[PDB]
Write an enzyme that holds these catalytic residues in place. Structure first.
Site, PDB file in Angstrom:
ATOM      1  CG  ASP A  25      -2.011   1.048   1.157  1.00 39.92           C
ATOM      2  OD1 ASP A  25      -2.960   0.951   1.959  1.00 39.92           O
ATOM      3  OD2 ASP A  25      -1.924   1.968   0.316  1.00 39.92           O
ATOM      4  CB  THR A  26       2.269   3.373  -2.751  1.00 33.29           C
ATOM      5  OG1 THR A  26       1.091   3.547  -3.549  1.00 33.29           O
ATOM      6  CG2 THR A  26       3.113   2.238  -3.309  1.00 33.29           C
ATOM      7  N   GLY A  27      -0.128   4.269  -0.537  1.00 30.21           N
ATOM      8  CA  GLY A  27      -0.868   5.358   0.113  1.00 30.21           C
ATOM      9  C   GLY A  27      -0.793   5.387   1.635  1.00 30.21           C
TER      10      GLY A  27
HETATM   11  C1  A00 Z   1     -15.957  -0.251  -1.935  1.00 27.42           C
HETATM   12  O1  A00 Z   1     -14.680  -0.857  -1.713  1.00 27.42           O
HETATM   13  C2  A00 Z   1     -13.800  -0.360  -0.660  1.00 27.42           C
HETATM   14  O2  A00 Z   1     -14.293   0.345   0.216  1.00 27.42           O
HETATM   15  N1  A00 Z   1     -12.502  -0.702  -0.722  1.00 27.42           N
HETATM   16  C3  A00 Z   1     -11.462  -0.118   0.124  1.00 27.42           C
HETATM   17  C4  A00 Z   1     -10.687   0.939  -0.623  1.00 27.42           C
HETATM   18  O3  A00 Z   1     -10.090   0.659  -1.654  1.00 27.42           O
HETATM   19  N2  A00 Z   1     -10.745   2.169  -0.095  1.00 27.42           N
HETATM   20  C5  A00 Z   1      -9.664   3.135  -0.105  1.00 27.42           C
HETATM   21  C6  A00 Z   1      -9.189   3.421   1.321  1.00 27.42           C
HETATM   22  C7  A00 Z   1      -8.475   4.757   1.455  1.00 27.42           C
HETATM   23  C8  A00 Z   1      -6.986   4.684   1.115  1.00 27.42           C
HETATM   24  C9  A00 Z   1      -6.150   4.014   2.211  1.00 27.42           C
HETATM   25  C10 A00 Z   1      -4.752   3.693   1.670  1.00 27.42           C
HETATM   26  O4  A00 Z   1      -4.804   2.599   0.744  1.00 27.42           O
HETATM   27  N3  A00 Z   1      -5.963   4.892   3.388  1.00 27.42           N
HETATM   28  C11 A00 Z   1      -5.086   6.073   3.260  1.00 27.42           C
HETATM   29  C12 A00 Z   1      -5.734   7.271   2.582  1.00 27.42           C
HETATM   30  C13 A00 Z   1      -6.701   8.025   3.485  1.00 27.42           C
HETATM   31  C14 A00 Z   1      -4.616   8.190   2.116  1.00 27.42           C
HETATM   32  S1  A00 Z   1      -6.523   4.510   4.766  1.00 27.42           S
HETATM   33  O5  A00 Z   1      -7.322   3.317   4.708  1.00 27.42           O
HETATM   34  O6  A00 Z   1      -7.323   5.556   5.306  1.00 27.42           O
HETATM   35  C15 A00 Z   1      -5.222   4.269   5.671  1.00 27.42           C
HETATM   36  C16 A00 Z   1      -4.862   5.142   6.702  1.00 27.42           C
HETATM   37  C17 A00 Z   1      -3.709   4.914   7.454  1.00 27.42           C
HETATM   38  C18 A00 Z   1      -2.907   3.813   7.171  1.00 27.42           C
HETATM   39  N4  A00 Z   1      -1.781   3.559   7.883  1.00 27.42           N
HETATM   40  C19 A00 Z   1      -3.265   2.956   6.140  1.00 27.42           C
HETATM   41  C20 A00 Z   1      -4.408   3.180   5.387  1.00 27.42           C
HETATM   42  C21 A00 Z   1     -10.540  -1.202   0.711  1.00 27.42           C
HETATM   43  C22 A00 Z   1      -9.385  -0.624   1.461  1.00 27.42           C
HETATM   44  C23 A00 Z   1      -8.122  -0.636   0.876  1.00 27.42           C
HETATM   45  C24 A00 Z   1      -7.018  -0.109   1.553  1.00 27.42           C
HETATM   46  C25 A00 Z   1      -7.162   0.428   2.829  1.00 27.42           C
HETATM   47  C26 A00 Z   1      -8.422   0.437   3.423  1.00 27.42           C
HETATM   48  C27 A00 Z   1      -9.526  -0.085   2.742  1.00 27.42           C
HETATM   49  C28 A00 Z   1     -11.257  -2.194   1.572  1.00 27.42           C
HETATM   50  C29 A00 Z   1     -10.820  -3.520   1.564  1.00 27.42           C
HETATM   51  C30 A00 Z   1     -11.457  -4.481   2.356  1.00 27.42           C
HETATM   52  C31 A00 Z   1     -12.536  -4.116   3.160  1.00 27.42           C
HETATM   53  C32 A00 Z   1     -12.975  -2.794   3.181  1.00 27.42           C
HETATM   54  C33 A00 Z   1     -12.338  -1.838   2.388  1.00 27.42           C
END
Ligand code: A00
Lengths: 99, 99
Positions: A25-27
């Site tokens: 996860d690059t984000g």
């Molecule tokens: C409809 O489908 C989905 O909802 N899919 C999700 C999706 O693609 N949403 C984007 C999420 C948001 C991106 C994310 C990084 O990739 N964040 C960081 C960003 C705020 C910059 S953060 O989650 O807020 C987070 C914060 C702190 C840290 N340290 C890590 C991550 C998916 C998910 C992927 C990665 C991270 C969280 C959720 C998911 C998978 C399984 C079950 C539920 C949801």
């Protein structure tokens, strides 16, 4: 390896002698793993996500193997949708984005 | 280019006549941008992750230019803490993880 993004970049990691699946996860600044047992002391950390902030347990200097590459670093433990390997460990395994 | 993960992989995007900064995010299934106007039809969607879920507007077939590369895809618009370019558009510019 070179990993394309047509599907989720899920890889196998090893931690505490156990295999888990985790998202490259690059984000994410930090590595966050689902509830598990880790050795040593932990300290408090707040991380901000899509849905808001959560409290996690911060464990430092943890041995973790990611797609066969050995790393030793900070692992956060808390209620995450999936195990995530963040930049703190992606840098350790020499990961870059390319296009 | 080859983009380091020592820092957040932030790039300049062009969308709907606007220049914006966005995170290249291999962990995100979908592209999610802070509140903005976009042309055409939309439908509501919930996207989730750390912290829980947020409600967004889903716009399909949106033209974007990412770091010089043109792409078309779905863009979600809502109360995200940061502009994110997700896998749905990363694939289109030929972005890969390498190590
Ligand atoms: C409809 O489908 C989905 O909802 N899919 C999700 C999706 O693609 N949403 C984007 C999420 C948001 C991106 C994310 C990084 O990739 N964040 C960081 C960003 C705020 C910059 S953060 O989650 O807020 C987070 C914060 C702190 C840290 N340290 C890590 C991550 C998916 C998910 C992927 C990665 C991270 C969280 C959720 C998911 C998978 C399984 C079950 C539920 C949801």
């Amino acid at each position: 390896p070179q990993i394309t993004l047509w599907q989720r970049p899920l890889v196998t990691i090893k931690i505490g002698g156990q295999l888990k699946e985790a998202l490259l996860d690059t984000g994410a600044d930090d590595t966050v793993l689902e509830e598990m047992n880790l050795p040593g002391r932990w300290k408090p950390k707040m991380i901000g996500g899509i849905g808001g902030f959560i409290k996690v347990r911060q464990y430092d200097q943890i041995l973790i193997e990611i797609c066969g590459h050995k790393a030793i670093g900070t692992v956060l433990v808390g209620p995450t949708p999936v195990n995530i390997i963040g930049r703190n460990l992606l840098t350790q395994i020499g990961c870059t984005l390319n296009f």
